[PDB]
Each structure stands twice: as C-alpha cells, then as structure tokens.
C-alpha cells in the first residue's frame with residue numbers, strides 16, 4: 001500500500017476495456033494509455049527484485065544447478081554477441097543433426113509447475129490465469145524471482161533486465177511505425193498487457209489466496225512488463241507430465257540460443273522426459289550456436305520476439321479482402337465459401353518469397369472475378385469435384401481472362417497500399433544507412449521498410465504475371 | 479503415443495491406417511478428412527480442445543519426439559497422390575513446417591486447451607494435420 005496505484009490502475013482497466021476508437025484515432029488512444037502507465041511507472045520503484053551483480057556473473061551458477069540435475073553443459077559457452085546479445089558459442093566442433101542440448105523437465109518452468117507452486121491457489125480461482133498460460137507463466141517467473149529459496153533462481157538471475165519488445169519502446173520509437181499494419185498489432189500488445197496489469201494488481205490486493213504471495217508487497221509495471229516480455233520472447237510449448245495436452249515452458253539454457261533461418265530442430269522427448277535440440281548446421285569451434293525460433297513474420301518478431309531478422313524467408317504482411325455485399329453474384333459465391341473453407345472475409349498474407357500470393361489467397365481472388373458461367377462449372381459436372389480441388393493450383397488456371405483481372409486488382413490494391421504508408425521505400429533505405437537510430441528504432445523502421453519491401457515483390461510479380469497471361473490471348477492455345 | 483485420440487467411448491484415427499475392427503465398430507468416416515472414428519468400451523483420457531490455437535506440438539514418429547509447429551487454419555488443400563490416397567479434395571488440413579515421413583501419420587497435435595488434430599499428410603518439408611476440434615459431437619455422452 002499505497003492505493004494511489006490501485007486508483008491509477010482502476011482507470012487503466014476501464015480505459016483499456018474500451019473497444020477500438022477507429023483507425024487514425026488509435027494513436028490518440030495509445031498515448032492516452034501510455035501516459036497513465038508512465039505516471040504509474042514513474043511512481044513505482046521499477047523492478048521489485050533486482051540482482052546485486054551483473055547478468056553474466058550468474059551464468060556459471062546456472063551451469064552447476066543445471067549439471068546437478070542432468071543438463072548438457074559442455075560444447076558451448078556464454079558470449080555477449082554484438083548482433084544478437086548473449087548467446088551460445090561452440091567450444092568444439094558440432095556437426096549437423098548432432099544432439100548437443102538436453103534439459104530435464106524438472107528444470108523447466110511450466111504452467112503445471114505454476115499450478116503446483118504458490119500461484120496455484122490463485123490459479124485455482126482466477127479464470128484469466130487459468131486461461132492464458134503466457135501470463136500464468138509470467139507470474140510463476142515473478143513469484144520465484146521474489147523467492148530467495150527458489151530452485152529456479154539460477155535461471156531467473158541469468159534473465160535480462162530489459163527487452164526490445166514494443167512494451168519498452170518510446171513514443172518517438174513507436175512514432176516511426178504509423179500507417180503500417182504492425183502498429184495496429186503493436187497497440188494490441190500494449191493495450192492487453194496494460195489491461196492485464198490493472199486487473200492483476202487489484203486481485204493480488206483483494207484475493208485471500210494472494211495474501212501469502214510476495215507480490216502483495218510489490219507488483220510494479222516494470223515487473224509485469226519484464227515478466228510477460230520474458231515469456232513471449234523465450235517460451236516453447238511442451239507436453240505436460242500426463243502428455244494429455246501441451247503447456248508453455250521456459251526451457252533454461254536452450255533459450256539463450258539466438259536465431260538464424262532454417263528448420264525447427266528443437267524437440268521434447270517425453271520418454272526421457274527432457275528437451276533435446278539437435279544442431280541445425282555445422283557449428284565450428286568459436287561459432288555461435290543458433291536455433292530456429294519458428295516461421296514467424298517480422299511483425300511477430302518485433303512484437304513477440306523483440307528483434308528484426310534480415311533475410312527472413314517467412315516475412316509476410318496481412319491483407320483484408322472480402323466479398324462486398326454489393327455483389328449481384330453473392331448467393332452463387334456464398335456456396336463455395338462453406339465448401340472451399342473460405343470465410344466471407346478474413347486476413348490473408350502477401351509473402352516475401354516466391355510466390356507472393358498463396359494458394360489460399362488465389363483460391364479467394366480467383367472466385368473474386370469469375371462470371372456466372374464459371375461458377376456453375378465448379379458446382380455441376382463430373383469435373384466439379386476435381387476442379388474445386390485444383391482451385392489453388394497455378395498450373396490449373398480456372399480461366400485465362402480471370403488471371404489478368406486478379407493481377408490487375410492486386411496491381412490497384414498493392415499500389416494503393418504503398419500510398420497508405422507515411423514514407424516511401426526509397427526514403428527508408430537511406431535512413432538506416434545514414435541515421436543513428438536506437439536499437440529499437442532500427443527494428444521498427446526496418447519492419448516498415450520490410451512491409452513495403454514485401455509489396456514491391458508482390459507488385460512486380462503481379463505485373464510479371466499479368467503481362468504473362470496477357471500474352472496468352474494471341475496463341476489461342478487449348 | 480497410440481497414434482489415435484481416445485476420448486469417452488470413441489476412438490479417432492486416420493482413415494487409411496484403421497484396423498478392420500475399427501470398421502467393425504464404425505461410428506463415422508470421411509475420406510475428405512483422412513479421419514475415422516470408432517466406438518470403444520473404455521473411457522479414453524484425451525480431452526478435445528475447442529480452441530482456435532494455431533501453435534501446437536506434434537509427435538514425429540520417425541524422430542520419436544514432439545515438435546512445436548505453427549499451422550494454418552483448417553482449409554481444403556491440394557494433396558498430391560501417395561500410396562494411400564490418389565489426389566482428391568482434402569479439407570480441414572492444417573499445414574505447418576516440420577519433419578513428417580511415412581509412418582509419422584498418427585502424431586497427436588495439441589493446443590494448451592487439449593488435442594488439436596492428428597497427422598494426415600506430409601511431404602515437401604510440410605506436415606498436414608486433420609482437424610478434429612470441429613466435431614463437438616465427439617464428447618462425453
């Protein structure tokens with residue numbers, strides 16, 4: 001206590017409990033919420049529990065505690081890399097597929113561990129903790145952070161103090177992401193996070209089962225902001241002890257490995273009850289041990305992982321497309337959507353790597369320029385079962401003329417989407433080479449560049465595909 | 479890891495790997511889903527998730543390990559012919575990147591709220607999961 005914070009949080013829940021004010025008005029609602037948070041944050045002591053030394057000084061303690069329970073601690077070391085921060089560096093030669101990490105479940109922080117810890121009585125009654133493990137795991141991290149007699153202390157002491165999540169960004173830092181699609185998701189991160197902090201700061205003060213928790217003495221925003229940021233950036237799903245379902249988990253040691261493109265090599269072996277990572281490629285002595293974090297977009301990387309990966313082959317931007325209710329052909333097209341698994345409208349993605357379109361967006365865009373005759377060609381006939389199946393195959397064009405329409409539509413839409421951005425692709429390239437941006441600012445701007453960089457490959461491909469199908473009218477081939 | 483979902487008095491498995499006894503105790507089938515459901519006498523201890531989770535962990539039989547995957551929504555996707563099914567419309571197929579080779583059909587995919595699906599297709603560095611969450615009728619009686 002004080003409860004000024006409780007009054008300051010009371011407002012955050014309600015304001016953050018509001019629906020979206022609109023587009024263009026969200027920034028005003030964003031800064032409304034940050035100001036109130038900044039008031040609370042500047043009225044609180046920051047991280048409730050702070051470690052006396054520096055981060056790296058606690059890495060040897062991690063290895064011993066891990067080695068006491070059977071974790072691989074040889075073949076790598078803790079090195080502060082410039083480009084990715086702390087990571088693992090091979091102390092010997094590691095071949096491809098060579099298993100070099102194994103971590104028993106006893107060391108991992110899992111929601112099943114949360115339900116068995118001091119948070120368990122609170123989890124028993126709270127439905128939000130019961131529902132969202134990413135939060136429930138964050139509180140498990142904070143509960144044991146404020147517990148000196150904790151099994152997982154050597155792990156928490158290695159965890160960072162700050163992260164590059166948009167939760168840590170400044171208003172100028174988020175100011176660069178305006179007119180983009182990611183910022184609409186960056187807001188959702190801040191809003192939901194803030195809202196959860198307001199809900200939970202109350203419940204700890206009011207719930208009896210929280211009386212024994214050490215968070216009742218101190219539960220700041222910088223605590224919670226660090227907590228969920230810790231979870232969203234280094235969480236991995238593993239099965240529970242019963243194996244009946246999965247659960248989120250903070251896998252120690254394995255999470256310090258940074259990211260490079262490739263395939264997911266990290267698996268959990270329930271038979272051995274432990275996590276196993278095989279080498280993605282050949283790691284010479286002194287080379288950093290990377291892992292593959294997943295096929296996530298650079299938007300998800302900034303928002304959920306906290307960095308921008310160059311040369312990501314899985315970068316993509318969303319695009320909202322739908323059948324306008326002003327269509328004379330709705331009812332005939334309303335049949336396909338239930339049998340082709342396509343919603344009436346939804347978010348589709350334009351992909352960086354070839355092809356920019358998906359087989360499912362093409363399965364939406366093809367039907368978005370058909371005539372009445374071609375709508376009964378898929379519905380009535382001995383080829384109606386084979387043709388709806390070959391709706392995503394580019395080598396099965398439904399009709400030659402429809403092709404140019406679909407690339408024309410995208411030519412119009414994509415060029416429009418470039419206009420929507422506050423800057424141009426040419427201006428963004430110069431700003432990274434010529435300006436001195438914050439570590440976080442560099443992340444956000446490269447994304448705003450990336451988003452436009454994705455479309456530029458979608459525009460010319462649409463242009464290349466449009467000219468191609470336009471050439472087809474001359475030969476009159478079958 | 480039995481290669482099948484055991485809930486209540488029901489047994490769910492890929493249609494192309496089912497034993498004849500499954501057809502002897504047939505409850506429901508679909509060639510367009512690679513999904514077969516059979517009646518059992520015991521009470522399976524698997525919970526059907528009714529979530530829209532899109533990040534889950536699946537068992538890779540060839541690697542004998544569980545793997546987290548980000549898979550797309552239940553959708554009708556082209557599957558080229560294999561030794562089991564010639565190419566034909568296949569719906570409710572969540573696709574993700576991972577290792578899935580012949581014999582890996584049967585890996586149980588799960589979300590934080592329970593089971594999501596079961597491996598149906600593979601190839602080209604992708605793994606296909608046949609969705610089950612939709613079948614609410616698949617619950618306790």
Ligand SMILES: Nc1ncnc2c1ncn2[C@@H]1O[C@H](CSCC[C@H](N)C(=O)O)[C@@H](O)[C@H]1O
Pocket residue numbers: 083084085086087160163164233234255256257258259305306307308309
């Ligand atoms: N390509 C990349 N560039 C920069 N940072 C990266 C990265 N891939 C992963 N990271 C870092 O990895 C963090 C999750 S844990 C990875 C270990 C990290 N060295 C550490 O000291 O914690 C991310 O939040 C991000 O800071």
